[PDB]
Enzyme design. Structure first.
Site, PDB file in Angstrom:
ATOM      1  N   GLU A  52     -14.810 -22.657 -35.646  1.00  0.00           N
ATOM      2  CA  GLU A  52     -14.267 -22.036 -34.657  1.00  0.00           C
ATOM      3  C   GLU A  52     -13.633 -20.389 -34.677  1.00  0.00           C
ATOM      4  OE1 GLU A  52     -15.374 -22.769 -31.509  1.00  0.00           O
ATOM      5  OE2 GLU A  52     -15.714 -25.105 -32.068  1.00  0.00           O
TER       6      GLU A  52
ATOM      7  N   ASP B 154     -16.678 -17.403 -25.272  1.00  0.00           N
ATOM      8  CA  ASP B 154     -17.477 -17.814 -26.468  1.00  0.00           C
ATOM      9  C   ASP B 154     -18.892 -17.374 -26.443  1.00  0.00           C
ATOM     10  OD1 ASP B 154     -18.512 -19.435 -24.547  1.00  0.00           O
ATOM     11  OD2 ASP B 154     -18.028 -21.373 -25.535  1.00  0.00           O
TER      12      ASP B 154
END
Ligand SMILES: [Cl-]
Ligand SMILES: [Cl-]
EC number: 3.2.1.17
Length: 162
Positions: A11, A20
């Site tokens: 991540e 994202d």
């Protein structure tokens, strides 16, 4: 290696609100804020999550706190899901992390939908499950990450991450 380090690698760490790969507002260590296309909406969810007026920026300690909570929610989630539990229960330690990684990323519901791969994991047919896992949107949109997860399930080791 362990699940935290593993996800910290998949991540990354960002202290300001960002988009994202799917284009949703996130922060910290993969903490999804909202699926909404409004920045204010995102800002509000953040304030609420953190418990303060953030103006879209947080601190490391804050990022870490949300990450602790999200990994926790994920374990619990799995252990509470009728489909995921039995699978998880069947696995060894490394592979269990791999399953946590997917639920962290996609949610219980998401993962619980990989019916077939799940059954293959339960049965310990590693190369078959690996092939099945790759036949997915998830794999197609995030090839590098999916590969690491998949290799973990296949090998039962941390090589993809070492
Ligand atoms: Cl939260
Ligand atoms: Cl990729």
């Amino acid at each position: 290696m362990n699940i935290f380090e593993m996800l910290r690698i998949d991540e990354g760490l960002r202290l300001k609100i960002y988009k994202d790969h799917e284009g949703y507002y996130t922060i910290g260590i993969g903490h999804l804020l909202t699926k909404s296309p409004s920045l204010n909406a995102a800002k509000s969810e953040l304030d609420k999550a953190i418990g303060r007026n953030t103006n879209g920026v947080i601190t490391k300690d804050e990022a870490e706190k949300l990450f602790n909570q999200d990994v926790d929610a994920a374990v619990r989630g799995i252990l509470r899901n009728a489909k995921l539990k039995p699978v998880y229960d069947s696995l060894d330690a490394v592979r269990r992390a791999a399953l946590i990684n997917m639920v962290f990323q996609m949610g219980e519901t998401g993962v619980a939908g990989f019916t077939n791969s799940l059954r293959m994991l339960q049965q310990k047919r590693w190369d078959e499950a690996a092939v099945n896992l790759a036949k997915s949107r998830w794999y197609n949109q995030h090839p590098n990450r999916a590969k690491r997860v998949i290799t973990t399930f296949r090998t039962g080791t941390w090589d993809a991450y070492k």
